[PDB]
Design a protein around this ligand. Structure first.
Ligand SMILES: Nc1nc2c(ncn2[C@@H]2O[C@H](COP(=O)(O)OP(=O)(O)O[C@H]3O[C@H](CO)[C@@H](O)[C@H](O)[C@@H]3O)[C@@H](O)[C@H]2O)c(=O)[nH]1
Ligand SMILES: Nc1nc2c(ncn2[C@@H]2O[C@H](COP(=O)(O)OP(=O)(O)O[C@H]3O[C@H](CO)[C@@H](O)[C@H](O)[C@@H]3O)[C@@H](O)[C@H]2O)c(=O)[nH]1
Ligand SMILES: [Mg+2]
Ligand SMILES: [Mg+2]
Ligand SMILES: [Zn+2]
Ligand SMILES: [Zn+2]
Ligand SMILES: [Zn+2]
Lengths: 375, 372
């Protein structure tokens, strides 16, 4: 895989936000004689594979068609560990286990499947002192974020060093394959243990674009509000397909809705933008790199209810508005746009996972790891 | 890449035609241990790439959009040589050379591009004593098959062992990438120098292909005297073959090109007629049909051609030296229901062509087929 090297990079405390890099060549082979281009970077196949041998890939699912979900699995590079974070109806779920069990047997590779609503998982989180996403039913709330939180735990428990997410509504297994290799690309290029790779692709769909352009703006306005100089650097406010080093995810709080992806950025700034005093010495001396990679394959998802467009505009502007770094002018610009689609709701934030006692969780799930695992 | 095992194989002379194989896992990583587990075939990445380093990938193009074309290019694995066989308007062709010169420069790889109406090529074919595809005007006729021919020549000259084709109208680089890897998968699975790989992806087009495959299966069954289900790639834009097999096959002009390939494999190597080719008689021919994970999504306009697809393919069969009265009739009934049938235009095998002559005749020119 060859990519553009980023022209400019946004320094913001110890955070480094790179501008969008295009993938030029999907598969650039096995190096042998290197040859140095300053303008782009060629990533060795072996190198990518080795990265993925340390990567977990999370496929979040709630009542997705089985054909699609198996399509997605077949696209994931062999080296990566598959975690299926499920929240489907019990019937559907048991079908998902069966599907994953067969795929993983046939392709001789380890996978993990678990259901968001497991009492054992709730029980485990309490034992680890992270009882924040547990609802009144006594069990973990519904939401994609909540599943991710659980997958992160599994990821941590499995000793994988990088985590990436991939939506299960993909029509194109080959686009999945590109996302996963792009994650690895980004982690190679990264020169810090703290790193995040966000993918973008460039009557109905035509309106999604004006929203993302406005979401992106809102975030650049935020950054500029601190910096004093205005920027266009962020192009990935929303990024369903994004990955981050495990060390970095345990460190970030995560919001709940369509606020999850944009809040990660807001959290990175608030934490490491060097406005507030920085606690973590390791982040202090390695810094953070955020990568924005633009993909060769068109994104094609299955949609079936698109009221959610207004909703995600709302969620992301809310984030920015409520950030501890938003200056009046930024808060105002965000108010006007919204009321232009008299009140602004605050996002729901779960504390960083670093807080969770892994040992306790581990103890909690002794008897059960058997059934999360598929051979 | 992990594939299913063909549930069954048609032996027809020294030809072996394998039943469709699904791709199960796009990228099966690096073997380091072993268990070819009864069910399936697992192909090492290293092996895949070593094959592709011997592969040319032809991309034919006639006024295709530049963005599409470059997308297709970005999808071709590094290891493969890119020949772009063009037949666009002369303005557009210059944009194409530009496009390719840039890509190949940036991604540090070699590529060839040629126009199908180049006088040097018509002249070179004549030098090699292959005057067959040259037109009235003194130039190689327009048509994809004519462009494919020219590519196979360039392929032969560049010393590559395998040629594959990829239509430039693809929306997905990843689909291209899967095609190219699947071609190498076939060539590895094969146990003979002479091997072919045919890709399929599973509204009016539906019936037509069902009926075209049926047409070949009836042809095949006609000779063996037992029915078969095996052909499912009667048409296959995206197909590859070992160069040794391609120089051995005659080629048809229309949409006829792909089906004829199979009709020709029967005629030549099914051993109804006597088989005179030491090497093919000793080694035999394997044909793979691989089913792809990625939906096919191309760009098309004014899709009338579905009918012309049917007529082309069923004509191939009708006029086979191996067609029986029954097949012939069956074929007529079908066409008639969409009183008189046309025989295809068939170019002789490229094996006859003198490359030494072509090499001589293309001296001062190779410089401009090759992009740095
Ligand atoms: N574990 C879990 N998974 C869920 C849940 N709800 C949905 N999912 C799964 O997670 C994905 C959510 O995708 P959609 O529900 O289709 O969301 P969207 O409207 O497509 O928005 C997506 O794309 C945006 C841009 O890429 C993202 O901003 C957003 O986060 C989401 O990924 C799907 O695979 C779905 O099956 C849940 O409560 N729990
Ligand atoms: N060199 C050359 N190329 C051509 C010519 N005409 C078309 N091409 C190029 O070769 C490919 C032919 O694609 P289409 O013209 O879209 O043909 P189609 O109707 O889409 O049918 C294709 O798919 C079928 C099944 O996959 C095939 O039956 C058929 O061969 C063809 O490849 C495209 O990249 C096109 O630009 C030509 O006269 N000369
Ligand atoms: Mg979706
Ligand atoms: Mg086409
Ligand atoms: Zn810039
Ligand atoms: Zn069969
Ligand atoms: Zn031999």
């Amino acid at each position: 895989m060859r990519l553009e090297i980023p022209n400019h990079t946004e320094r913001f405390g110890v955070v480094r936000l790179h501008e969008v890099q295009r993938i030029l060549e999907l598969d650039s082979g096995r190096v042998r004689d290197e040859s140095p281009a300053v303008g782009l970077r060629r990533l060795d196949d072996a190198d990518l594979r080795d990265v993925l041998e340390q990567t977990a890939i999370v496929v979040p699912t709630r009542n997705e068609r089985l054909k699609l979900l198996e399509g997605v699995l077949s696209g994931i590079p062999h080296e990566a560990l598959i975690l299926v974070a499920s929240n489907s109806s019990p019937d559907r779920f048991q079908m998902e286990r069966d599907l994953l069990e067969e795929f993983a047997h046939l392709t001789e590779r380890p996978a993990l499947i678990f259901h968001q609503k497991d009492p054992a998982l709730a029980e485990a989180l309490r034992a680890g002192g992270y009882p924040h996403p547990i609802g009144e039913d006594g069990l973990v709330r519904s939401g994609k974020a909540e599943g991710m939180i659980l997958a992160l735990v599994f990821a941590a428990l499995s000793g994988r060093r990088y985590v990436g997410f991939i939506d299960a509504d993909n029509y194109f297994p080959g686009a999945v394959w590109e996302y996963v290799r792009a994650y690895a690309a980004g982690f190679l290029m990264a020169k810090t243990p703290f790193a995040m790779v966000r993918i973008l692709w460039r009557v109905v769909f035509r309106r999604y674009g004006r929203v993302s352009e406005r979401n992106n703006r809102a975030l650049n306005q935020l950054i500029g509000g601190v910096s004093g100089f205005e920027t266009d650097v962020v192009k990935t406010a929303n990024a369903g397909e994004h990955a981050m080093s495990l060390g970095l995810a345990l460190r970030l709080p995560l919001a709940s809705g369509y606020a999850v992806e944009p809040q990660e950025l807001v959290s990175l700034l608030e934490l490491y933008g060097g406005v507030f005093p920085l606690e973590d010495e390791e982040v202090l001396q390695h810094g953070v790199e955020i990568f924005q990679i633009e993909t060769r394959n068109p994104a094609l998802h299955e949609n079936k209810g698109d009221e959610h467009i207004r909703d995600m505009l709302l969620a992301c502007l809310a984030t920015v508005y409520h950030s501890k770094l938003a200056t009046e002018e930024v808060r105002q610009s965000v108010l006007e746009e919204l009321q232009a689609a008299e009140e602004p709701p605050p996002p729901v934030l779960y504390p960083p996972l670093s807080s969770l006692d892994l040992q306790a969780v581990r103890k909690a799930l002794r008897g059960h790891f058997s059934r999360f695992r598929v051979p």
